[PDB]
Scaffold this active site. Structure first.
Site, PDB file in Angstrom:
ATOM      1  N   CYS B 152       0.812  -1.100   0.108  1.00 37.18           N
ATOM      2  CA  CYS B 152       0.013   0.126   0.156  1.00 37.18           C
ATOM      3  C   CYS B 152       0.931   1.299   0.004  1.00 37.18           C
ATOM      4  CB  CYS B 152      -0.984  -0.081   0.955  1.00 37.18           C
ATOM      5  SG  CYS B 152      -0.302  -0.412   2.840  1.00 37.18           S
ATOM      6  N   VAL B 156       0.351   4.390  -2.421  1.00 38.44           N
ATOM      7  CA  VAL B 156       0.171   5.742  -1.811  1.00 38.44           C
ATOM      8  C   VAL B 156       1.043   6.667  -2.832  1.00 38.44           C
ATOM      9  CG1 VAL B 156       0.051   7.208   0.032  1.00 38.44           C
ATOM     10  CG2 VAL B 156      -1.207   4.796   0.001  1.00 38.44           C
TER      11      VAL B 156
END
Ligand code: ICS
Ligand code: ICS
Ligand SMILES: [Ca+2]
Ligand SMILES: [Ca+2]
Ligand SMILES: [Ca+2]
Ligand SMILES: [Ca+2]
Ligand SMILES: [Mg+2]
Ligand SMILES: [Mg+2]
Ligand SMILES: [Se]
Ligand SMILES: [Se]
EC number: 1.18.6.1
Lengths: 477, 522, 522, 477
Positions: B152, B156
């Site tokens: 993640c 991001v």
């Protein structure tokens, strides 16, 4: 194997790597010399892992949520961010407790904010405030909340400290923001440090102006025992039989009140140096509480530790110390008499996190076993300083070992037993090498104290000597 | 204390009186514990309809989810390719968790690397990590393919996998023709099954998009099979076995059954078996492509239909009697091969078992959860057995799926008392099994804590868990089982009926009290 | 009373207050029941060492036997031959019981006829019953072979089967060429396994004794396999599967797996599959004959050695790792076929499972019973798992067998606390599991009453039953299981370890009491 | 099917048989005519089975030990002879009881003399005497012993009556010799008669001179209910709600004392005529106790039976009778309302032992079902007399049906449901015909009384309407 042979083994293994990785990994592999006291002359540690090499390390969230905070039993720990981290770490670590799960204790539950795209794009601070209200509704007997940040939280600019302060004031509740995102640091290690500072900043000072707790001269805290399979209980029993009063356990089976009472103790007993030295130093600075390292693995270390601890008190505790030692003498001698002849001379290689790779060596030695290699995922050089005198001359030391390295070292060294983690276990069993999990205790334990040593010995014997290991070669090959 | 000839581990060591007394002193002295009567009062309240209503109003808090994150699924997909290393671009802590999760379920090694991005990468991205990571992985582990997904952090900060891989090749870190398929796998979208779909579609595109001009549909006389996220070894095996028995040419695309079941013969095998690069390159030449788990293969389906021009059949997961029949009839239609005598007989043996066991299954009430396709297949087979799925939970389900399952419930009188839940977790399910108690739960190991909770209310309120799904961590070797086909249906039936009879024996084991019904023959 | 939307069967109907009160009134009014305190006193006494010593002094009384009578075995043997009707000469009550016993274990039809001798036959013998019986059976049920055994009436009055069958053919009741092999099967000698041996030897003699002059050992390049009394379908299947995988020519002599597993497809098939008459006629031309269960195939062995001149190898039942290895190595030696890669891998998967599960198996203590070969194989595999088989009971075992098992125990440190019992029953075993409590029992459904008894003493004294053996009547479809070869070893290991972990979960499910050890991962 | 069609079905089926069997079997197959009152004009019964034809019948030991004696819960029943008979019959029949098994109750245990060769050659009477002593040692709370003879006992000339007398006198114990060897008679039937005569001769007279039992005008015994799945308990409840006192149950859940008290009752209520008419007649002859047949299958029969029973007593019992009927009316009406629309019109074929093939017909009719064929294993013509009025015109009757016959009849008649035993169950299921066990109740029940009718209805519905039956044909055939 000789020093020259081990050095040769290190060079041969490093041959596979591209140049940048080869030069890096050479600095993290050493042949022990117990004469050396400054490990920064022979090994580098606590550096980034090399990309692509299959490190066994975890992240700062594992070190904060999974290790330090998660065991605190009467708080709710929120895995804040997307769903993965909390799910993989739900009840994986055997930090045992007594409680009514879902009601007054919450350790094996997974609370999460389950971030979706809208939370990444617009931030999760409104979600976190609403989540806190839902926790309060559905879990009214919680005694406090922690917020364990996952990777996205700092990357998107959320302000969990503001949410924690505002909500904490509104509900008159301890709500602890923990900036343990996995992008921080290089391993579990920085998560310990972050987590210790969060305890310091948000919990430990709550009772600084409270004079109601009745202290005694024999008050201690167990610092850095996460009660794996009950290890802290099998430690606590001995301390109390010696006449001390164990006010707190950090953090296995720990409660928030015990943490808050810890500044009232006379002596902090540190088992895991790596994870809790930070707060131990803080408490000496702020409250004048001394701390000392100890070791409850095996009878030789346990006896040495009981005596060293008792020496900090008066003659009455030194007398109880000798009583405790006399009580358990026949019990551990019976364990040795049964199991040492079954294990004598067997050679073990270890690979664990930040304490056990040196701490368990005495217990092996108490069964006549030799630790021929050891290493750590995330130790610092102060850990290696403590290791080199515990390990034999010319043994192998490895920091942040790659999967490739560990397999190749084992192929050469041909240890009788390996003690490491779940990601290693099934590899080495297929090679026909008896393997014991030295994080989870292979669902056994406790291993601390006298009662733990009996189980340790049983376990090493049941695996090393098991009939399965004679059967890997088909009789037609 | 210990007695050397009968050493006690934690259970039952800590029930010795000295430990009991010590733990009572700890509690009273230092834990400031809520009184037992208050604990009891709150517990009772958590079993109520009032509490259930509050629980189901949650919008922000998730408790005890029944799903994982995308990259887990990408890793499983990647493991099913020959000599392929799963590689997750991003944070290493993720990979420690993915490996351990699978290690615990399969009791097998699980090989996967990270490129160890740290905070420093937030300034100028993970390009250098990709370059060194790919070079290092290839040198060290000698894969023939590296299948790249993301954590993640990488999502991001916005790292462009395609550009990064291209630049790794441009600058000589990995050979130009070395296969490096990729997929973006954000943990904050969908779930682990979505990561499987993403990864698979990435691998299919890598081997086929640019080479479509020589492909002819049907020219290789095979059927492609895409299994999706699958954690029972018996499921890969039964599909291969049935197609082989039918004489159907096939290619199983993503096939980890060998690498998740290597022998213990003195050597560690990092790679074994798997779908070959040759199979993936030749896949557009098949007659057609069958998706075993269509409710998480929607992206794959779009690619296979849009690019390979395969007319992917509308088939449910081959679970239970009707859907296994439908699968075999469709395969027969596509391949031109008849359904053979061996499979007809196997089918009739399942029906025989159904006739034999129907009286004990009839009307039994189940709560159950899992991934969408598994759950729909289990619901279907339970209706076929004359059982009542009453609480059907799919945390990672969607509205379209729920409508489909509601339709299946409507085609059966045994569906009348059933509700489908999407977006709800195991703390929601816990309320349902207190407020509308079923006979059993069918679910993964997280279910054990619900069973514990129900027993605390009382033995008459206990809802036993039957372990079918993923993960199963507290039993050994259940990952060898089968849930697909007639063989899977026979296994599920056997487990259900014997779970019912085991519970009945428990309830009737009380001498002179309930043992009037402790029958020898059932 | 009943509520129509939740109807109660006997359990829990008779726990309603009105039934409880009624039952108390019946007891107090009319049953003259011993006071509960005296029942409790006597129960407690039956759990003691003093009682055990009296129990083991029995010479005349048998209680809860763990064996059946010869003709049951003859019937199972006969069912294994193509289009063969088992025919028991004697009393019809026997045949009702044999059929029902097998019906309950296999949940299948079991076809067997009687010739319905009555008291009148004591004067004159059962010759007319045989004549009409054979005629009637052949006409009605159209078998291609009738295999004749006897009930104890026919044995005591001394009917000469050979003469009776010969007279049936002489007088035209059945064709001269129609095969009617026979065996005397007295219920008062040995047990059901003995009846299997007798029947098989009779069938072997029928087809081969008079035609030996043209036979040449090894000329058909096959190995004969004689399975003995076998009630797991998976056992016939795994032997055939292993020999086919190895490319070994074989003939399985008595093969009931098809007739005990017909499909439910709208027709009843009285006969299916089985050993052909051609196979039995050609059997002396094999390379050799392997006996899977030699401890109940002694008469067969003498015939095969003495008449077929096969050099029957000294092999144990192929159970567990070492004995499966020995079986395959002997088959390789006889056949000249190498052990294939598929079996090598399967073996290594079993070893993998052993390494995976060893910590939970280690040191676990078992009581077990069954037939001699099954019990010795179970003992051997338990030793291989690092388990302690402490109470080994074989009602129908003999001294030579017991010496053989005692030798197996001596070759392992895990044998040190074990005792072998022969001629003892399940009421003897009940005492052992009270006085020298093991962790589990491995046995057939009759063990459930021992578990019931142990629980009555207290939960801490309860010895759970693990159902492996014959008969199993209170669970469904366990007859489909396997206990032979690597597959069977994998199945047994999985059942054992999961029985251990189920019990541990039961013992740790108590909230705030024992659930500190209710681990998600084991 | 018309009478002519059924007649032609019988002739077609009998074509397979040799002439001797054909001529015999023709006499045991009939097309019902409910106008006939003398069944000896249309069917033969209670004859030998033809050799080789796969009768479903058992033997006299099954009728004595398995049926009459084995249920008596506080006695020990010895299966005397070789091991088989006792083992196959151990806990096969669901004759339910309340007790502490192995201690004061013994029903599901198998006690045997396990005859070996030496016992056949030299006799078993010394073994039996030793066995009795061992029983007394190890089972001291037994209240009596029965000796259930297997085939060899009479064949070898043993004298079990002498052993029973001598040992009974020595131990002051009721020891009952039962000559129920399987060679006697033709079926279970003669074992009933033997067993009844043994109760008469060795048990029933024990309290003939004893006046201590406190009798009342409302004392009854249930004769011939073996409490399958609790059937006698669901009967008993209704009799006692009607104001009667049930002194004894023969023999389900029965005790030896209840048997010995039975001569003190005012009325014997006979459910199973076939098995217990013998002792019922004896009790009327010797003690003047009247008996009457009743039927507790389904609401119509149960209501008729309660009223007929109450009519034998006074106004107080007649009044309670209507109270009972009123109480249960809504309960059975609710059962009918739910299940009759699910079963209306469905056709049924039965094959059972000696009572149920006629006795259950009313219960079927209470659910709108039609019994289109029925028959018995071992019924006598007095049973067929009672059957022909209960069955419809032109239905099929079969006595001691062969397996071949039963299959062929089912193939032509194509019933919706079959009710028979375990040896029939799996055949008919493979044919796609729903099957209910009508001996064991398929491990369900009770079926007697109002509470039993609810379970019967549930059961017939769950099986006849089950989704499995639509699945036998593969969609590609
Ligand atoms: Fe890490 S530094 Fe890490 S003594 Fe504790 S989780 Fe030591 S339960 Mo797991 S075993 Fe000190 C740890 Fe446990 S060597 Fe291990 S990695 S906190
Ligand atoms: Fe035989 S004459 Fe036989 S009402 Fe009872 S054993 Fe009826 S439990 Mo089994 S069901 Fe009257 C019998 Fe049961 S029709 Fe059946 S054969 S005693
Ligand atoms: Ca393994
Ligand atoms: Ca494994
Ligand atoms: Ca069947
Ligand atoms: Ca009415
Ligand atoms: Mg039930
Ligand atoms: Mg109830
Ligand atoms: Se750690
Ligand atoms: Se009967």
């Amino acid at each position: 194997m000789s020093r020259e042979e081990v050095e040769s083994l290190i060079q041969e293994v490093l041959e596979v790597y591209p140049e940048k990785a080869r030069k890096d990994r050479n600095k993290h592999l050493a042949v022990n010399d117990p004469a050396v006291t400054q490990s920064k002359k022979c090994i580098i540690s606590n550096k980034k892992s090399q990309p692509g090499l299959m490190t066994i390390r975890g992240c700062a969230y594992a070190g904060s949520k999974g290790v330090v905070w998660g065991p605190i039993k009467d708080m709710i720990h929120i895995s804040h961010g997307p769903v993965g981290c909390g799910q993989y770490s739900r009840a994986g670590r055997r930090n045992y407790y007594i409680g009514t799960t879902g009601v007054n204790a919450f350790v094996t539950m997974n609370f999460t904010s389950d971030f979706q795209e809208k939370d990444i794009v617009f931030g999760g601070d409104k979600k976190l405030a609403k989540l806190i209200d839902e926790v309060e509704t559905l879990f009214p007997l919680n005694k406090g909340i922690s917020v364990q940040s996952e990777c996205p939280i700092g990357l998107i600019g959320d302000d969990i400290e503001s949410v924690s302060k505002v909500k904490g004031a509104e509900l008159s509740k301890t709500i602890v923001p923990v900036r343990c995102e996995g992008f921080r640091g290089v391993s579990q290690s920085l998560g310990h440090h972050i987590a210790n500072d969060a305890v310091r900043d948000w919990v430990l000072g709550k009772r600084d102006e409270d004079t109601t707790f009745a202290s005694t001269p024999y008050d201690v805290a167990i610092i850095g025992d996460y009660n794996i399979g009950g290890d802290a209980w099998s430690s606590r029993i001995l301390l109390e039989e010696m006449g001390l009063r164990c006010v707190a356990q950090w953090s296995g089976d720990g409660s928030i009140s015990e943490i808050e009472l810890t500044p009232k103790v006379k002596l902090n007993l540190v088992h895991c140096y790596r994870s809790m030295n930070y707060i131990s130093r803080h408490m000496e600075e702020k409250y004048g509480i001394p701390w000392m390292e100890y070791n409850f693995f095996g009878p030789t270390k346990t006896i040495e530790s009981l005596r060293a601890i008792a020496a900090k008190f008066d003659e009455s505790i030194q007398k109880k110390c000798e009583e405790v030692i006399a009580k358990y003498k026949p019990e551990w001698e019976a364990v040795v008499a049964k199991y040492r002849p079954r294990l004598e001379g067997k050679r073990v290689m270890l690979y664990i996190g930040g304490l056990r790779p040196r701490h368990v060596i005495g217990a092996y030695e108490d069964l006549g076993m030799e630790v021929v290699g050891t290493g750590y995922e995330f130790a610092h050089n102060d850990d290696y300083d403590r290791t080199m005198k515990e390990m034999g001359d010319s043994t192998l030391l490895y920091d942040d070992v790659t999967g490739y390295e560990f397999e190749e070292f084992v192929k050469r060294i041909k240890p009788d037993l390996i003690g490491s983690g779940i990601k290693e276990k099934f590899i080495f069993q297929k090679m026909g090498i008896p393997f014991r999990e030295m994080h989870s205790w292979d669902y056994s334990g406790p291993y601390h104290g006298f009662d733990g040593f009996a189980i340790f010995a049983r376990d090493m014997d049941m695996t090393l000597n098991n009939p399965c290991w004679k059967k890997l070669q088909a009789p037609w090959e | 204390s210990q007695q050397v000839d009968k050493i006690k581990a934690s259970y039952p060591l800590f029930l010795d009186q000295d430990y009991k007394d010590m733990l009572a002193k700890k509690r009273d002295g230092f834990e400031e514990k809520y009184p037992q009567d208050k604990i009891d009062e709150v517990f009772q309240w958590t079993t109520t309809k009032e509490y259930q209503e509050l629980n189901f109003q949650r919008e922000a808090l998730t408790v005890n989810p029944a799903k994982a994150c995308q990259p887990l699924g990408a890793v499983l997909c990647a493991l099913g390719f020959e000599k392929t290393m799963p590689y997750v671009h991003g944070s290493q802590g993720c990979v420690a968790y993915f490996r351990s999760y699978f290690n615990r379920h399969f009791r097998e090694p699980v090989s996967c690397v990270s490129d160890s991005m740290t905070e420093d990468a937030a300034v100028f991205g993970g390009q250098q990590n990709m370059k060194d990571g790919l070079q290092n992985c290839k040198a060290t582990y000698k894969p023939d393919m590296i299948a790249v997904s993301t954590t993640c952090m990488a999502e991001v900060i916005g790292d462009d996998l395609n550009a990064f891989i291209n630049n790794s090749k441009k600058e000589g870190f990995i050979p130009d023709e070395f296969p490096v398929p990729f997929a973006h796998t954000p943990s904050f979208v969908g779930s682990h099954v979505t990561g499987w779909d993403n990864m698979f579609e990435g691998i299919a595109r890598y081997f086929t998009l640019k080479s479509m001009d020589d492909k002819v549909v049907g020219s290789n006389k095979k059927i492609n099979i895409v299994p999706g996220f699958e954690t029972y070894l018996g499921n890969f095996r039964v599909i291969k076995r049935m197609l082989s028995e039918m004489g159907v040419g096939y290619s199983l695309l993503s096939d980890p059954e060998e690498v998740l079941d290597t022998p213990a013969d003195g050597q560690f095998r990092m790679y074994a078996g798997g779908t070959t690069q040759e199979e993936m390159k030749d896949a557009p030449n098949a007659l057609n492509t069958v998706l075993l788990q269509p409710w998480h293969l929607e992206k794959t389906k779009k690619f296979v239909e849009g690019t390979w021009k395969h007319e992917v059949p509308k088939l449910n997961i081959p679970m239970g009697l009707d859907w296994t029949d439908e699968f075999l009839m469709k395969v027969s239609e596509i391949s031109g091969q008849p359904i053979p005598a061996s499979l007809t007989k196997e089918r009739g043996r399942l029906v025989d078992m159904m006739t034999d066991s129907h009286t004990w299954l009839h009307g039994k009430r189940f709560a159950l959860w899992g991934d969408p396709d598994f759950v729909m297949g289990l619901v279907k087979f339970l209706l076929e057995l004359g059982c009542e799925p009453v609480h059907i939970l799919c945390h990672n389900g969607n509205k379209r799926w729920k409508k489909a399952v509601d339709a299946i419930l409507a085609a059966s009188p045994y569906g009348k008392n059933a509700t489908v839940y999407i977006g709800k977790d195991l703390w929601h399910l816990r309320s349902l099994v207190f407020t509308d108690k079923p006979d059993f739960m069918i679910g993964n190991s997280y279910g054990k804590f619900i069973q514990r909770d129900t027993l605390h209310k009382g033995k008459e309120f206990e809802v036993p868990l039957i372990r079918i799904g993923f993960p199963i961590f507290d039993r050994h070797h259940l990952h060898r089982s089968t849930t697909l086909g007639y063989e899977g249906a026979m296994q599920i039936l056997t487990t259900l009926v014997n779970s019912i009879l085991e519970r009945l024996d428990e309830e009737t084991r009380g001498m002179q009290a309930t043992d009037y019904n402790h029958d020898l023959v059932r």
